[PDB]
Design a protein around this motif. Structure first.
Motif, short mmCIF file in Angstrom:
data_model
loop_
_atom_site.label_atom_id
_atom_site.label_comp_id
_atom_site.label_asym_id
_atom_site.label_seq_id
_atom_site.Cartn_x
_atom_site.Cartn_y
_atom_site.Cartn_z
N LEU A 1 0.82 -1.20 0.00
CA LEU A 1 0.00 0.00 0.00
C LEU A 1 0.86 1.26 0.00
O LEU A 1 0.42 2.32 -0.47
CB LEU A 1 -0.96 -0.02 1.19
CG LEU A 1 -1.97 1.11 1.25
CD1 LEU A 1 -3.27 0.60 1.85
CD2 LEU A 1 -1.37 2.26 2.05
N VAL A 2 2.08 1.15 0.51
CA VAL A 2 3.00 2.28 0.52
C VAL A 2 3.55 2.45 -0.90
O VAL A 2 3.72 3.57 -1.39
CB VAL A 2 4.17 2.05 1.50
CG1 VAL A 2 5.16 3.20 1.42
CG2 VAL A 2 3.62 1.94 2.93
N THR A 3 3.80 1.33 -1.57
CA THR A 3 4.31 1.35 -2.94
C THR A 3 3.30 2.04 -3.85
O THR A 3 3.68 2.84 -4.70
CB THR A 3 4.53 -0.07 -3.50
OG1 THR A 3 5.54 -0.72 -2.73
CG2 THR A 3 4.95 -0.02 -4.96
N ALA A 4 2.03 1.70 -3.66
CA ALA A 4 0.94 2.26 -4.45
C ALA A 4 0.77 3.75 -4.18
O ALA A 4 0.41 4.50 -5.08
CB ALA A 4 -0.36 1.53 -4.15
N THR B 1 1.01 6.71 -6.86
CA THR B 1 -0.01 7.74 -7.04
C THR B 1 0.61 9.13 -6.92
O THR B 1 0.12 10.10 -7.50
CB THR B 1 -1.12 7.58 -5.98
OG1 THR B 1 -1.74 6.29 -6.13
CG2 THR B 1 -2.17 8.67 -6.14
N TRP B 2 1.71 9.21 -6.18
CA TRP B 2 2.41 10.47 -5.97
C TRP B 2 3.27 10.82 -7.18
O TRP B 2 3.26 11.96 -7.63
CB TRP B 2 3.26 10.38 -4.70
CG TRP B 2 4.02 11.62 -4.36
CD1 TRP B 2 3.54 12.90 -4.31
CD2 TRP B 2 5.39 11.69 -3.94
NE1 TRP B 2 4.53 13.76 -3.89
CE2 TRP B 2 5.67 13.04 -3.66
CE3 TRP B 2 6.41 10.74 -3.77
CZ2 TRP B 2 6.93 13.48 -3.22
CZ3 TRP B 2 7.67 11.17 -3.34
CH2 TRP B 2 7.91 12.53 -3.06
N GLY C 1 10.37 -1.06 -3.68
CA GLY C 1 9.00 -0.72 -3.96
C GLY C 1 8.93 0.62 -4.68
O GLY C 1 8.03 0.86 -5.50
N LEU C 2 9.90 1.48 -4.38
CA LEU C 2 9.95 2.79 -5.00
C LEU C 2 10.38 2.71 -6.47
O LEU C 2 10.04 3.58 -7.27
CB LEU C 2 10.88 3.70 -4.20
CG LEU C 2 10.94 5.15 -4.66
CD1 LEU C 2 11.14 6.05 -3.45
CD2 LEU C 2 12.05 5.31 -5.69
N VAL C 3 11.10 1.65 -6.81
CA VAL C 3 11.52 1.45 -8.19
C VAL C 3 10.31 0.94 -8.98
O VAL C 3 10.10 1.33 -10.13
CB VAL C 3 12.67 0.42 -8.29
CG1 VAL C 3 13.02 0.16 -9.74
CG2 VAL C 3 13.90 0.95 -7.55
#
Ligand SMILES: CCCCCCCCCCCCCCCCCC(=O)OC[C@H](CO)OC(=O)CCCCCCCCCCCCCCCCC
Ligand SMILES: CCCCCCCCCCCCCCCCCC(=O)OC[C@H](CO)OC(=O)CCCCCCCCCCCCCCCCC
Ligand SMILES: CCCCCCCCCO
Ligand SMILES: CCCCCCCCCO
Ligand SMILES: [Rb+]
Ligand SMILES: [Rb+]
Lengths: 103, 106, 219, 106, 103
Positions: free
Chosen positions: A84-87, A91-92, E83-85
């Motif tokens: 959910l943090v990845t998503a 979205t950001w 996850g940021l990638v």
């Protein structure tokens, strides 16, 4: 603020709650089973963290039905929270990129 | 179920010497061993936790060492008040278990 | 060059304490750990403890009675070990060693001989050992020097400032009435002495003394 | 705490033979064993690291083998200069420990 | 360049820093604890990489409180970085797809 960000935060607090509750319930479910090692709270909390993150070194793990059910809830909560943090980060970046393109 | 072997069952030492109590586990239990002292007609008293951690209110002359299957409880400069039975206890795997005990004799 | 420098000796009265030093040189990394090892005469190597200079944390052997306290001075690259309230059981050679954080002791110090006793420090008397007048010689000749009445140990004996190493025997000391005594032997071709000088050098760290004694034929 | 057993304590070999020093660990430690040589009145000297790795400045006649709990330090064509005490040391689990040592005798 | 891409890079450099610092701190925290194996830097660095990626084979793991705290930071840094990638790749495919649809 924005939804995705609020959800990210909520997911974090809820994950912390699942870790604590999971540490407590793991011990409760495992004591009584001969051979079980997930039987004291400090290490149980360490176990919950490595299950939530899915690292799962294997130094600790449930051997009873209820312990394993507790483990699944922890795993799902961790996987969901981190996903959910990845998503939220997606979205950001999508919104910011919409700006950089003047759209 | 983990078996804790404490041998010899009796230790004869002279006043002031450094004595060592042995505790062997039937399988590796990290440092999840705890030591208790029980004087004649008294209840057990925690002396060392997790193989080497100090407990407040316990004379500094008491110490513990070991990990895995071999553990030792040492007493520097033994003295009359140290006469008692000494037990080890493991909390690595359920159920918790106790060693047969070792009596200190001066 | 010597990566770890330790003083040769320290005499300590029972109950007293001493602070051993270890000056490092050569490459130094934030990941280096300095170890201390205790070796009693005739026995093995016993690990005392370790310290990481870049951070200042130290760990100690839990199996033995704690007599040490480790510290380190980053600016002077010196590691220290404070031994306190010692007894004869604490008499031994104490080595310091450097570990690069990868598990092995790549280098060791020469070691510091610590002697716990009430006796007083006494520099050695060095006497010549030249053959007697009726002694016949072969292609080789044996000379030596007598080192007696010293305390505490050790003494380091060299010949011609170390330039003469072959044919040398320095016997272990014997203790009698709070004093040690030993002799050192040297053998050179008979044709080369006294034409070429032969001198034993005796260093006694405990008294910060180093004396020479040329060996010349008897009158 | 890992126990390192070095037996026999003394090895009698003839000049030129290949000698072998044994080192047994109380538990599996991979290849985290190191060997040191200490001549009479000298300080220890690293000979082999991690059970078989060469060290610069050390005669090629020295080699090591083993893994798990059994380790061997070998010397091809032994000679007078090899007379000394030989110690093994493990760095697999804290604290580091030493073997009792083995003396080489020619 | 674009945000998501810069963040991806930053996350990589920051992850490398956490791995190194984590390798250093792990050893610092673990030595002193009998039985600990996460006690030399080369393998500690290997440990940090398998924690960051969450593979966690179980050949190495912290046994002390501080070591485990170090481990959590490593896990979170790895999970977040990777996850940021993923999110940066999503922001990239979304933009490109907006083009392919002439929007
Ligand atoms: C980030 C979270 C890291 C958790 C590390 C746990 C290490 C346990 C340990 O090896 O710590 C060892 C340490 C003793 O050496 O234990 C202690 O007392 C220190 C406190 C440890 C943990 C807090 C208490 C447990 C709370 C669990 C929930 C209980 C609900 C009821
Ligand atoms: C991609 C990263 C892969 C890491 C593999 C580590 C293997 C360790 C080893 O089995 O390597 C084995 C090898 C010896 O055989 O070790 C060595 O010297 C080789 C160098 C290895 C690692 C670099 C040094 C460690 C730096 C850690 C941070 C310290 C901060 C202070
Ligand atoms: C998530 C399952 C409920 C929590 C575990 C309860 C165990 C009770 C004892 O058997
Ligand atoms: C992230 C926690 C701080 C780093 C570990 C410090 C350990 C100091 C020794 O106990
Ligand atoms: Rb895993
Ligand atoms: Rb695993």
């Amino acid at each position: 603020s924005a939804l995705h960000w609020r959800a990210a935060g909520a997911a974090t607090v809820l994950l912390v709650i699942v870790l604590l509750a999971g540490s407590y319930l793991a011990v409760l479910a495992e004591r009584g089973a001969p051979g079980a090692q997930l039987i004291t709270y400090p290490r149980a909390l360490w176990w919950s963290v490595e299950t939530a993150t899915t690292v799962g070194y294997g130094d600790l793990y449930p051997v009873t039905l209820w312990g394993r059910c507790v483990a699944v809830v922890v795993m799902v909560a961790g996987i969901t929270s981190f996903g959910l943090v990845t998503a939220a980060l997606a979205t950001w970046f999508v919104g910011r990129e919409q700006e950089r393109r003047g759209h | 179920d983990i078996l804790l072997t404490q041998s010899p069952a009796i230790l004869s030492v002279s006043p002031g010497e450094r004595v060592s109590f042995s505790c062997r586990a039937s399988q590796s239990i990290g440092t999840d061993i705890h030591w208790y002292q029980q004087r004649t007609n008294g209840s057990p008293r925690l002396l060392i936790k997790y193989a080497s951690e100090s407990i407040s209110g316990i004379p500094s002359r008491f110490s513990g060492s070991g990990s895995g299957t071999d553990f030792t409880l040492s007493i520097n400069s033994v003295e009359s008040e140290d006469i008692a039975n000494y037990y080890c206890q493991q909390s690595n795997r359920w159920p918790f278990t106790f060693g047969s005990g070792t009596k200190l004799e001066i | 060059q010597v990566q770890l420098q330790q003083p040769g000796a320290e005499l300590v009265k029972p109950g007293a304490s001493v602070k051993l030093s270890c000056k490092a040189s050569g490459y130094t990394f934030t990941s280096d750990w300095i170890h201390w090892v205790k070796q009693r005469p005739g026995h093995g190597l016993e690990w005392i403890g370790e310290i990481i200079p870049s951070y200042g944390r130290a760990n100690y052997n839990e199996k033995i009675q704690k007599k040490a306290t480790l510290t380190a001075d980053k600016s002077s690259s010196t590691a220290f070990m404070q031994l306190s309230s010692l007894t004869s059981e604490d008499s031994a050679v104490y080595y310091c060693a450097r570990e690069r954080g990868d598990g092995y002791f790549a280098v060791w110090g020469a070691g510091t001989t610590v002697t716990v006793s009430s006796a007083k420090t006494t520099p050695p008397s060095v006497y010549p050992l030249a053959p007697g007048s009726a002694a016949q010689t072969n292609s080789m000749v044996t000379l030596g020097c007598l080192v007696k009445g010293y305390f505490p140990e050790p003494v380091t004996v060299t010949w011609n400032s170390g330039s003469l190493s072959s044919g040398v025997h320095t016997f272990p000391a014997v203790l009698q009435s709070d004093l040690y005594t030993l002799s050192s032997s040297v053998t050179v071709p008979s044709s080369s002495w006294p034409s070429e000088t032969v001198t034993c050098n005796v260093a006694h760290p405990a008294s910060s003394t180093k004396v020479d004694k040329k060996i010349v034929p008897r009158d």
